């Protein structure tokens, strides 16, 4: 089946953000995320992961939030962004029944309009439609973290989670 | 005493491409100064995280805006200094490497003064917001993209700095200051 994740980031200005998100295992709501940048609460509605494993996952998600905010702050500092703004990240993994490779995605929208998205084949980000876009892509396509580590989260971590918690 | 007030004289390298020693050249010859190409007089006011102000030409920013700039530039300059002093890491004739080292030690001391002046805006150590007193992991996650951008092989230099702070000792900035103070010690001893 599938694990979908949604994150909405409401920026009042470059330095303050309110996060609001959730995750689902095929229709069923499993996780919620909410709070300001400094105190974001992340919860698994059902004890799917044991304490140790959940604490590790939360640590990864909190590191992600700090990095994500950093990237937005960088784009603003370098290219200027118009505030307030909202960013939406929609990502996940889908396992076909008799299908070898899991389908994965990570799509970013800004103020309700498609912006950039991840292409897992070569682990590169592309525009979904320009100084801001060009700069953002340059950054996302520059580092192992935003390319290969991200692909491994989607294709490996996400897929194993679906296989363990649905099956 | 609701609103705490401080003066912070920030030694700005420059948001430019180049050797750290040439922009801070005017600061290396002229250390303590109200003038100098690298002087930046800030006046900050802090009540809540809801209400805070900072001012400098006559720009007025939020404390968060100033602090992001200050931490971001502290981390960029540290890496720029470290790469420059790498060749300065024992016996010579009034060395350029020794002059670079003298300015770095002076610069670390200036940055500590900037940091302590920023800290005066907070009454007690027990209650300084998490937002401004981040740990090693948090600080290195929060400033990943902003610092890394300035450097070719930036991801590696950032990881090197994080491992070195993790080896040292708590707030990442105190650990960073311990690491800088130590770099200056090693540098001065291996140069003189
Ligand atoms: C076990 C399954 C795990 C799931 C846990 C279940 C809980 C679900 C809760 C749902 C809510 C969260 C929604 C956010 C999803 C993001 C997931 C983070 C990805 C992740 O973990 O990857 C880390 C790197 O992230 C990065 O790649 C960092 C780069 C960030 C950039 C992202 C692009 C967006 C920016 C676009 C903004 C543009 C603005 C410009 C105008 C490394 O993972 P690790 O540390 O675990 O790996 C250890 C293995 N060695
Ligand atoms: C995302 O949507 C935002 C919706 O609020 C939008 O912000 C709005 O647009 C501009 C910013 O470019 C603001 O500026 C206008 O108002 C000020 C006074 O507040 C005037 O001085 C200006 O001349 C101008 O007319 C709007 O105020 C602002 N709307 C609100 C409710 O604050 C962002 O621009 C959008 N951002 C992106 C990146 O798409
Ligand atoms: C940065 O990226 C390269 C990949 O482009 C790393 O090399 C390996 O390549 C695979 C992808 O083909 C990565 O997923 C692995 O993590 C890497 N293999 C090993 C054994 O580590 C390269 O090592 C990376 N360099 C740094 C300094 O992070
Ligand atoms: C996930 O969050 C968005 C907004 O934060 C919301 O519209 C959506 O309905 C949520 N999903 C579920 C299953 O409630
Ligand atoms: C963190 O935020 C949530 C709401 O998002 C709030 O209920 C909680 O009390 C906050 N945590 C702290 C430490 O105050």
Grouping H, G, I as helix, E, B as strand and the rest as coil, residue B1 is: coil
Partners of A118 in beta bridges: A125
What's the Cα-to-Cα distance from A119 to each of A109, B2, B95, rounded to whole Å? Answer: 15, 52, 52
Q: What are the beta bridge partners of residue B5?
A: B45
**Which chain B residues touch A77 with a CB distance below 8 Å?**
146
Number of A/B CB contacts below 8 angstroms equals 46
Residue A116 pairs with which residues in a beta bridge?
A: A108, A127
Q: How far is CA B18 from the centre of its chain?
A: 17
Q: What is the DSSP string of B41-91?
A: EEEEEES-SSSEEEE----EE-HHHHHHHHHHHHHHHHHHHHHHHGGG---
Determine the Cα–Cα distance for residues A2 and A12; give it in Å rounded to an integer: 33
Residue pair B165/B179 in contact (Cβ under 8 Å)? The answer is yes
Instruction: Write out chain A in H/E/C secondary structure.
Output: CEEEEEEEEEEEECCEEEEEEEEEECCEEEEEEEEECCCCEEEECCCCCCHHHHHHHHHHHHHHHHHHHHHHHHHHHHHCCCCCEEEEEEEEEECCCCCCCCEEEEEEEECCEEEEEEECCCCEEEECCCHHHHHHHHHHCCCHHHHHHHHHHHHHHHHHHHHHHCC
Q: Which helix (H) or strand (E) holds B156?
A: helix B154-168
Cβ atoms of residues A127 and A133 within 8 Å: yes
Ligand 5 atom closest to the CA of A34, numbered from 1: 5
Angle at A106 between CA A101 and CA A109, to 5 degrees: 155
Check A16 against B64: CB less than 8 A apart. Answer: yes
Task: Give the method used.
Answer: X-ray
> Which domains occur in chain A, in start order?
1-167 (3.30.500.10)
Euclidean distance between CA atoms B141 and A129, whole angstroms: 28
User: Could you give the 3-state DSSP secondary structure of residue B95?
Assistant: coil
H or E element at residue B97: helix B96-119
Cβ separation B146–A73 shorter than 8 A: yes
Q: Give the whole-angstrom CA distance, residue A101 versus residue B105.
A: 56
The dihedral built from the CA positions of residue B161, B167, B171 and B176, taken in this order, carries a sign that is negative
Distance between CA atoms of residues B176 and B169, nearest Å: 10
- What string of H, E and C letters represents the secondary structure of B13-49? CCCCCCCHHHHCHHHHHCCCCCCCCCCCEEEEEECCC
> Which residues in A lie closer than 8 A to residue B145 (C-beta atoms)?
67, 70-71, 73-74, 139
What stretch of H or E contains B165?
Answer: helix B154-168
The first and second tokens of residue B62, run together, are 């939020």
Which residue of B lies nearest to A72 if distances are taken between CA atoms?
B145
Q: Where are the domains of chain B?
A: 1-192
Nearest by CB to B155, from A13, A63, A143: name it: A143
Ligand nearest to the CA of A147: 1
* CB–CB contact A16 B137 (8 Å): no
Beta bridge partners of A35: A19
Q: Do residue B146 and residue A66 have CB atoms under 8 angstroms apart?
A: no
Q: Which pair of structure tokens corresponds to residue B132?
A: 């401004």
Q: Are B20 and B80 in contact (CB under 8 A)?
A: yes
Write down how long chain B is: 192
Query: Partners of B141 in the beta sheet?
Result: none
CB B75 within 8 A of CB B160: no
Tokens 């580590």 locate to A149
Residues of B in contact with A66 (CB under 8 A): 138, 141-142
Q: What residue owns the CA closest to ligand 4's atom 8?
A: A22
Peptide bond into B107 cis (omega under 30): no
Question: Measuring from each residue's beta carbon to the nearest atom of ligand 2, which residues come in under 6 Å?
Answer: A 81-82, 84-85, 110-111
Residue A36 C-alpha from the chain's centroid: 17
Q: How far is A70 from chain B (nearest CA, A)?
A: 5
Question: Which tokens hold the place of B56?
Answer: 């400098």
Compute CA distances B169 → A17, B140, B144, B184, whole Å: 31, 16, 21, 17
Can you tell me which atom of ligand 2 is nearest the CA of A85?
1
How far does A6 lie from chain B, in Å, by closest CA?
A: 21
Q: How far is CA A24 from CA A27, A43, A123, A154, in A?
A: 6, 12, 24, 15
Are β-strands A2-13 and A85-94 bridged in parallel, bridged antiparallel, or unpaired? Answer: antiparallel
Residue B116, number of CB atoms within 10 A of its CB: 12
B154-168 vs B63-85: helix crossing angle, rounded to 10: 90
Spatial contact of A20 and A33, defined as CB atoms under 8 Å apart: yes
Quick one: which of B40, B33, B34 has its CA closest to B13?
B40
Contact indicator for B190, B89 with CB cutoff of 8 Å: yes
Q: Is A131 on the interface with B (CB under 8 A)?
A: no
A124-127/B4-9 β-pairing: unpaired
Per-position b or e across A123-152, b if 16+ CB within 10 A of its CB: bebeeeeeebbeebbebbeebeebbeebbe
Closest CA to A85 of A35, A136, A10, A19: A10
Backbone angles phi, psi at B45, to 5 degrees: -130, 125
Alpha carbon B88 to its chain centroid, in Å, reads 20
What separation, in Å, do the N-terminal and C-terminal C-alpha atoms of chain B show?
46
CA distance B112 to chain A (A): 24
Token pair for B75: 């981390």
Count of positions (residues) in chain A? 167
Whether A70 sits inside 8 A of B141 (CB atoms) is: yes
Q: Quick one: closest CA in A to B49, which residue?
A: A16
Q: Entry resolution in angstroms?
A: 2.9
Q: Report the C-alpha gap between A29 and B176 in whole angstroms.
A: 42
B140: left (phi over 0), alpha (psi -120 to 50) or beta: alpha
């Amino acid at each position: 089946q599938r694990l979908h994740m949604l994150q909405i980031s409401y920026f009042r200005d470059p330095y303050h953000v309110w996060y609001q998100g959730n995750a689902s295992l095929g229709g069923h709501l499993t996780h919620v995320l909410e709070g300001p940048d400094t105190n974001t609460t992340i919860i698994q509605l059902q004890p799917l992961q044991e304490p140790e494993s959940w604490a590790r996952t939360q640590s990864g998600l909190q590191s992600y939030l700090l990095q994500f905010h950093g990237l937005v702050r960088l784009v603003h500092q370098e290219r200027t962004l118009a505030f307030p703004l909202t960013i939406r990240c929609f990502l996940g993994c889908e396992l076909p029944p008799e299908g070898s490779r899991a389908h994965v995605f990570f799509e970013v929208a800004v103020n309700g309009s498609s912006f950039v998205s991840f292409r897992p084949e070569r682990a590169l980000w592309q525009a979904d439609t320009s100084g801001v876009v060009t700069f953002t892509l340059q950054q996302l396509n520059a580092y192992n973290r935003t390319r290969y580590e991200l692909r491994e989260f989607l294709e490996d971590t996400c897929v194993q989670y679906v296989q363990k918690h649905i099956s | 005493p609701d609103v705490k007030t401080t003066e912070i004289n920030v030694i700005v390298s420059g948001d430019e491409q180049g050797i750290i020693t040439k922009k801070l050249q005017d600061f290396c010859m002229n250390p303590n100064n109200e003038n100098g190409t690298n002087n930046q007089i800030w006046k900050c006011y802090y009540k809540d995280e809801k209400e805070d102000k900072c001012k400098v030409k006559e720009k007025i920013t939020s404390f968060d805006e100033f602090f992001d700039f200050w931490v971001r530039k502290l981390l960029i300059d540290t890496i720029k200094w470290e790469t420059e002093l790498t060749y300065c890491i024992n016996a010579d004739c009034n060395n350029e490497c020794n002059k670079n080292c003298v300015c770095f030690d002076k610069w670390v001391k200036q940055k500590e003064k900037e940091w302590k002046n920023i800290m005066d805006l907070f009454t007690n150590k027990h209650d300084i917001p998490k937002k401004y007193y981040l740990n090693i992991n948090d600080l290195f996650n929060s400033f990943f993209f902003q610092v890394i951008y300035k450097f070719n092989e930036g991801e590696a230099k950032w990881n090197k700095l994080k491992e070195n702070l993790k080896k040292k000792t708590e707030a990442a900035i105190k650990v960073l200051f311990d690491h800088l103070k130590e770099t200056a010690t090693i540098c001065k001893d291996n140069n003189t």
